[PDB]
């Protein structure tokens, strides 16, 4: 059920600083923040998709919620 | 169901006003909670037009004390407007307590157990508790004295817990010394009580004859708005919390505020000397005023420690700050609220402190942990006031949902719920006996509560605007009240407590006129603080606002 | 990207040079995770390029937060006392230590009184929870949130 | 004015008798800022659904997706009572008798040597 | 240390904003005036922000110099990601 495997998160820190170690509390809170992000983004994207009268959840729907509420602008 | 709520409510409105007058005044209590629970259930099930029509037909038969809640409700017409209110969200899930007598409940249940009104009976037994007492039905001016809150007039089973309302050192109402782990009494703290009882030697007995002298310490310019005052227990320092995010300590004795010397200067002097504290003071830094910076918002709480170090301040930015008064810097920033902390106070023994904020809790801190120890989380609105008991085993938290609640420091349990104010409570004080509690709110009423019996013992209704400061005398002879009508009223706090149930109420006397010893008007100056010198001299502080 | 002179462009380009001056979510449990929230809206199936787009969106959410907490976890590892361009101004900790020494002298006097009564008878950077909390109350999201409010008690 | 006389009636319906004259001017400035960010997002959502007319479901979407981010609230009562009973179960710690000035650990206080640059 | 050198030069420099006014809005947020040079660097940073917005607005006015209008501040702050609002209610 866990989508972030707690070891790829440590590679997200090694790419920024080769000498840095998070605390176990910090790692668990970061995992909760990730889970919460996935849930909020998917719920709002699904609201945009129902709005577009669709049952498909295409990226256009996920990409629009990032640009308007989070300002991420991930290349599609 | 939803299109006939103006037929269910108007039928019960027709039954109650056609009753006999002894039971009519007590059965008028369920007009307000049945009006809100039917209105909020209409707007939660997305029936806006019917909700608006119900509000228009019945809002004006509601008691005058409920206008503020009625205006918040008139704004609420949608469901998503109410889904982010969090006060009407907790009102919809809780139960109105609605203390009624058994003589009037028999007429109510003989009008609801019949199928003719099985819908309004279904709303009553779903949304309303009914707490029955065996006794006389209360009068209308006695019901008016004890209602006014949302989810108000709480059960007697809450006000029956054993409360150790006595002072520490035999008193059977006193808690043991090892109940709450209070700090030790040092030799410098024992030296304070030696000169404290020299002040008690010159202390005058106030009473209704020897009325005290009031020394008003007005803030003259104060164009940054003064939001918090505190005075030390000996009248030596006066703190000021201001809207320009500053705390300003003033010395009122002829003794300038000095910081202690730097660490290089203390390393060359020796300890073990008799002078020591005198040796450490720096005379290069000596002012009649020290300004403290570091809050990013208007400082709302100000609290001295009883050893005259350790100023406390809370502000809009959500932090409580512990300022030293020996180095005159900030020491700790206590970040537990994300929201404006409206009040803070040190314990009268000086280790723990309680801070109440906009997030509807009051936290108990200890000046040793970055995290709180107790979270007092039962209020439905902002915790406006937070006051410690004189034994510091109990914390009284007044709030904006018109309730005052005592909280045991052990177990964090609410042991008393005091309802009967019509506005948000803006001042609390305890009697020096520990037996009584005076609360003031925006309705100008000072309600005197018993703590052992959990019963209000008197109502002082002289003030016009928000009563923002209360204090009892050092003996307990006089309660001083200061409000926004620029008056310092003095009340007889001995004749107000001359009598010490199972009906859960006492017949309040309507005796305010006999308990007013005097009213003194300030020149355009709201009385923010009231303090009693240990020789029983009233001190008051307020910014002069010409307005 | 929509703004050519955008202000968060210059932030994370100067933040990286400040840290230089000292996620890829699993595709199989994520695809079940999107579909269960889709039952509450009627979004019964999802596009095959979305479950890897949300994984790229979760990465740039946490990499924007890992970089943000790294530049405040290295804010505490700047020792001023090795440099001599800086001068010490106010050390409260040392004054407190002198006060503690005086308190210990008082305790020793108390012990002597008790004895008399008896006779009569390569810097490594570790990120704390403070560095994560500091990067939550500043950004607009998660400033008034139940995840930061609970983090004040963890 | 037209919209400024309605703003003095929203305040008087809330019982606000006394207010500064700059209070009406900046609640209108907030009300204008709020409607030009609902309708700005409404035509973004209309172009997502590919319709030339911004109809009422677009404004229903742009309101509830702006109220999900902008206007927050304090934590709810079932959340405050759960973190209370998780915190109020822990017993109060005892106090060391002569520890000194009672403070948190030094990484939680504001007591550091607090340096400054040499003037030269 | 280019900026440390600049701050050391900032003594004997008077900025366009006074330090009694820059220090007032710093004291409002908890920042207290320990060192004048730090107040002066903060004042100069604020000045650079306003000046850069103004210069971009002037390039827009020259393209469409002289009067600064809200329709010059609107595309000038749009590359900054700031949507400026017309009054429209007075």
UniProtKB/Swiss-Prot annotation, chain A:
Q: Which residues carry this modification: Phosphothreonine?
A: 5
Q: Which domain of life is it from?
A: Eukaryota
Q: Where is this protein localized, as stated in its record?
A: Nucleus
Residues in Histone-fold domain copies: 5-72
Summary of the tissues where the protein is detected: Ubiquitous.
Oligomeric state and interaction partners are given as: Component of the TFIID basal transcription factor complex, composed of TATA-box-binding protein TBP, and a number of TBP-associated factors (TAFs), including TAF1, TAF2, TAF3, TAF4, TAF5, TAF6, TAF7, TAF8, TAF9, TAF10, TAF11, TAF12 and TAF13. Component of the TATA-binding protein-free TAF complex (TFTC), the PCAF histone acetylase complex and the STAGA transcription coactivator-HAT complex. Component of the PCAF complex, at least composed of TADA2L/ADA2, TADA3L/ADA3, TAF5L/PAF65-beta, SUPT3H, TAF6L, TAF9, TAF10, TAF12 and TRRAP.
Record's family? Belongs to the TAF12 family.
What role does it play? The TFIID basal transcription factor complex plays a major role in the initiation of RNA polymerase II (Pol II)-dependent transcription. TFIID recognizes and binds promoters with or without a TATA box via its subunit TBP, a TATA-box-binding protein, and promotes assembly of the pre-initiation complex (PIC). The TFIID complex consists of TBP and TBP-associated factors (TAFs), including TAF1, TAF2, TAF3, TAF4, TAF5, TAF6, TAF7, TAF8, TAF9, TAF10, TAF11, TAF12 and TAF13.
What name does the UniProt record give this protein?
Transcription initiation factor TFIID subunit 12
Shown portion of the complete protein runs from 55 to 130 of 161
Curated annotation (Swiss-Prot), chain B:
Tell where it localizes.
Nucleus
Region called NTD2, residue ranges: 1-131
Query: Biological process (GO) annotations?
Result: DNA-templated transcription initiation; mRNA transcription by RNA polymerase II; positive regulation of DNA-templated transcription; positive regulation of transcription initiation by RNA polymerase II; regulation of DNA repair; regulation of transcription by RNA polymerase II; RNA polymerase II preinitiation complex assembly; transcription initiation at RNA polymerase II promoter
The entry lists its GO molecular-function terms as: identical protein binding; RNA polymerase II general transcription initiation factor activity
Asked if the record carries the keyword Zinc, the reply is no
Query: Which UniProt key words apply to this protein?
Result: Host-virus interaction, Nucleus, Repeat, Transcription, Transcription regulation, WD repeat
WD repeat residues = 221-260, 294-333, 336-377, 378-419, 420-459, 462-500
Spell out the coiled coil positions from the record: none
**Which family is this sequence assigned to?**
Belongs to the WD repeat TAF5 family.
Q: What is the annotated role of this protein in its UniProt record?
A: The TFIID basal transcription factor complex plays a major role in the initiation of RNA polymerase II (Pol II)-dependent transcription. TFIID recognizes and binds promoters with or without a TATA box via its subunit TBP, a TATA-box-binding protein, and promotes assembly of the pre-initiation complex (PIC). The TFIID complex consists of TBP and TBP-associated factors (TAFs), including TAF1, TAF2, TAF3, TAF4, TAF5, TAF6, TAF7, TAF8, TAF9, TAF10, TAF11, TAF12 and TAF13. The TFIID complex structure can be divided into 3 modules TFIID-A, TFIID-B, and TFIID-C.
Source organism: Homo sapiens
Curated annotation (Swiss-Prot), chain C:
Localization, UniProt: Nucleus
Where is the segment annotated Minimal region required to interact with TAF12? Answer: 23-65
Family, according to the entry, reads as follows: Belongs to the TAF4 family.
What function does the entry list?
Answer: The TFIID basal transcription factor complex plays a major role in the initiation of RNA polymerase II (Pol II)-dependent transcription. TFIID recognizes and binds promoters with or without a TATA box via its subunit TBP, a TATA-box-binding protein, and promotes assembly of the pre-initiation complex (PIC). The TFIID complex consists of TBP and TBP-associated factors (TAFs), including TAF1, TAF2, TAF3, TAF4, TAF5, TAF6, TAF7, TAF8, TAF9, TAF10, TAF11, TAF12 and TAF13.
Oligomeric state and partners? Answer: Component of the TFIID basal transcription factor complex, composed of TATA-box-binding protein TBP, and a number of TBP-associated factors (TAFs), including TAF1, TAF2, TAF3, TAF4, TAF5, TAF6, TAF7, TAF8, TAF9, TAF10, TAF11, TAF12 and TAF13. Component of the TFTC-HAT complex, at least composed of TAF5L, TAF6L, TADA3L, SUPT3H, TAF2, TAF4, TAF5, GCN5L2/GCN5, TAF10, TAF12 and TRRAP. (Microbial infection) Interacts with SV40 Large T antigen.
Linked pathology is: Intellectual developmental disorder, autosomal dominant 73: An autosomal dominant disorder characterized by intellectual disability ranging from mild to severe, developmental delay, speech delay, behavioral abnormalities, and non-specific dysmorphic facial features.
The organism encoding this protein is Homo sapiens (Human)
From Swiss-Prot, chain E:
Where is it located?
Nucleus
What about PTM? Allysine formation by LOXL2 results in release of TAF10 from promoters, leading to inhibition of TFIID-dependent transcription.
Comment on protein domains: The [KR]-[STA]-K motif is specifically recognized by the SETD7 methyltransferase.
Q: Which family is this sequence assigned to?
A: Belongs to the TAF10 family.
Function per UniProt? The TFIID basal transcription factor complex plays a major role in the initiation of RNA polymerase II (Pol II)-dependent transcription. TFIID recognizes and binds promoters with or without a TATA box via its subunit TBP, a TATA-box-binding protein, and promotes assembly of the pre-initiation complex (PIC). The TFIID complex consists of TBP and TBP-associated factors (TAFs), including TAF1, TAF2, TAF3, TAF4, TAF5, TAF6, TAF7, TAF8, TAF9, TAF10, TAF11, TAF12 and TAF13.
The annotated subunit structure for this chain is: Component of the TFIID basal transcription factor complex, composed of TATA-box-binding protein TBP, and a number of TBP-associated factors (TAFs), including TAF1, TAF2, TAF3, TAF4, TAF5, TAF6, TAF7, TAF8, TAF9, TAF10, TAF11, TAF12 and TAF13. Component of the TATA-binding protein-free TAF complex (TFTC), the PCAF histone acetylase complex and the STAGA transcription coactivator-HAT complex. The PCAF complex consists at least of TADA2L/ADA2, TADA3L/ADA3, SUPT3H, TAF5L TAF6L, TAF9, TAF10, TAF12 and TRRAP.
The scientific name of the source species is Homo sapiens (Human)
């Amino acid at each position: 059920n866990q989508v972030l495997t707690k070891k790829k998160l440590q590679d997200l820190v090694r790419e920024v600083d080769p000498n840095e170690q998070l605390d176990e509390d910090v790692e668990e809170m970061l995992l909760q923040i990730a889970d919460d992000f996935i849930e909020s983004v998917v719920t709002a994207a699904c609201q945009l998709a129902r709005h577009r009268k669709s049952s498909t959840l295409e990226v256009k729907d996920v990409q629009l919620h990032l640009e308007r509420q989070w300002n991420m602008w991930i290349p599609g | 169901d939803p299109t006939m709520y103006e037929e269910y409510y108007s039928g019960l409105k027709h039954f109650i006003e056609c009753s006999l007058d002894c039971h009519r005044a007590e059965l008028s209590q369920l007009f307000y909670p049945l009006f809100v629970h039917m209105y909020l259930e209409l707007v939660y099930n997305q029936h806006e037009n019917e909700a608006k029509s119900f509000f228009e037909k019945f809002h004006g038969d509601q008691e005058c004390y409920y206008q503020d809640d009625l205006r918040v409700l008139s704004s609420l017409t949608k469901k998503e407007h109410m889904k982010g209110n969090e006060t009407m969200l907790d009102f919809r899930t809780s139960k109105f307590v609605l203390r009624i007598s058994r003589d009037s409940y028999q007429l109510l249940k003989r009008h609801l157990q019949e199928k003719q009104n099985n819908q309004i009976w279904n709303i009553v037994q779903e949304h309303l508790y009914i707490d029955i007492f065996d006794g006389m039905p209360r009068s209308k001016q006695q019901i008016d004295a004890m209602v006014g809150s949302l989810a108000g007039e709480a059960k007697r089973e809450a006000n029956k817990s054993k409360v150790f309302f006595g002072l520490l050192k035999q008193d059977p109402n006193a808690p043991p010394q090892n109940r709450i782990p209070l700090p030790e009494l040092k030799d410098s703290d024992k030296l304070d009580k030696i000169m404290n009882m020299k002040e008690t030697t010159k202390r005058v007995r106030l009473g209704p004859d020897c009325l005290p002298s009031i020394c008003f310490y007005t803030f003259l310019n104060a164009y940054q708005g003064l939001t918090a005052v505190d005075v030390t227990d000996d009248s030596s320092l006066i703190a000021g919390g201001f809207a320009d995010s500053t705390v300003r300590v003033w010395s009122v004795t002829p003794k300038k505020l000095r910081s202690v010397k730097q660490a290089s200067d203390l390393s060359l002097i020796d300890k073990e000397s008799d002078d020591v504290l005198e040796r450490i003071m720096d005379e290069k830094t000596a002012s009649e005023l020290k300004i403290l910076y570091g809050h990013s918002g208007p400082v709302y709480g100000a609290s001295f420690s009883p050893d005259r170090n350790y100023l406390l301040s809370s502000s809009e930015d959500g932090t409580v700050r512990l300022w030293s008064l020996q180095t005159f810097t900030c020491l700790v920033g206590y970040k537990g609220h994300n929201y404006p902390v409206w009040d803070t106070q040190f314990s009268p023994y000086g280790y723990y402190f309680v801070s109440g904020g906009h997030d509807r809790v009051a936290r108990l801190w200890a000046t040793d942990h970055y995290q709180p120890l107790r979270i007092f989380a039962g209020h439905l609105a902002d915790v406006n006031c937070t006051r410690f008991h004189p034994n510091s085993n109990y914390v009284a938290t007044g709030s904006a949902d018109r309730t005052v609640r005592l909280w045991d420091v052990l177990n964090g349990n609410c042991v008393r719920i005091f309802t009967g104010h019509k506005g948000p409570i803006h001042s609390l004080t305890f009697s020096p006996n520990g037996r009584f509690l005076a609360t003031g709110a925006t309705d100008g009423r000072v309600l005197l509560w018993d703590i052992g019996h959990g019963l209000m013992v008197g109502e002082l209704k002289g003030h016009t605007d928000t009563v923002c400061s209360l204090r009892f005398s050092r003996d307990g002879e006089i309660l001083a009240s200061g409000s926004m009508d620029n008056t310092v009223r003095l009340w007889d706090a001995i004749k107000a407590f001359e009598d010490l149930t199972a009906t859960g109420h006492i017949n309040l006397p309507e005796n305010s006129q006999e308990l007013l010893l005097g009213t003194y008007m300030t020149k355009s100056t709201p009385v923010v603080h009231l303090h009693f010198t240990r020789r029983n001299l009233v001190l008051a502080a307020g910014a002069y606002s010409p307005q | 990207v929509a703004s050519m002179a955008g202000v968060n462009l210059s932030e994370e380009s100067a933040r990286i040079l400040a840290t230089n001056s000292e996620t890829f979510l699993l595709q199989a449990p994520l695809q079940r995770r999107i579909l269960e929230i889709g039952k509450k809206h009627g979004i019964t199936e999802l596009h095959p390029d979305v479950v890897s787009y949300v994984s790229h969106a979760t990465q740039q959410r946490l990499q924007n937060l890992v970089e943000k907490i790294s530049e405040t976890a290295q804010q505490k590892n700047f020792s001023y006392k090795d440099d001599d361009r800086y001068e010490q101004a106010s050390d409260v900790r040392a004054q407190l230590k002198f006060f503690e020494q005086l308190d210990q002298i008082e305790k020793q006097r108390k012990d002597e009184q008790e004895r008399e009564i008896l006779m009569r008878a390569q810097r490594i950077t570790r990120v704390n929870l403070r560095d994560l909390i500091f990067c939550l109350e500043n950004e607009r999201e998660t400033s008034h949130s139940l995840l930061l409010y609970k983090a004040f008690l963890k | 004015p037209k919209d400024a006389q309605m703003m003095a009636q929203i305040l008087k319906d809330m019982g606000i008798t006394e207010y500064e004259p700059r209070v009406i001017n900046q609640m209108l400035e907030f009300a204008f800022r709020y409607v030009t960010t609902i309708l700005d997002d409404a035509k973004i959502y209309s172009s997502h659904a590919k319709k030339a007319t911004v109809d009422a479901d677009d404004v229903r979407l742009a309101i509830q997706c702006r109220a999900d981010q902008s206007f927050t609230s304090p934590p709810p009562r079932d959340f405050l009572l759960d973190i209370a009973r998780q915190r109020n179960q822990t017993p109060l710690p005892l106090i060391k008798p002569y520890s000194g000035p009672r403070l948190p650990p030094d990484r939680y206080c504001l007591t550091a040597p607090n340096y400054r640059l040499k003037s030269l | 240390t280019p900026l440390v050198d600049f701050l050391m030069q900032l003594e004997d420099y008077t900025p366009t904003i006074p330090d009694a006014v820059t220090g007032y809005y710093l004291n409002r947020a908890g920042f207290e005036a320990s060192d004048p040079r730090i107040i002066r660097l903060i004042s100069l940073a604020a000045q650079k922000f306003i000046s850069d917005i103004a210069n971009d607005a002037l390039q827009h006015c020259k393209m469409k110099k002289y009067t600064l209008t809200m329709e010059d501040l609107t595309p000038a702050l749009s590359e900054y990601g700031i949507n400026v609002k017309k009054p429209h209610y007075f």
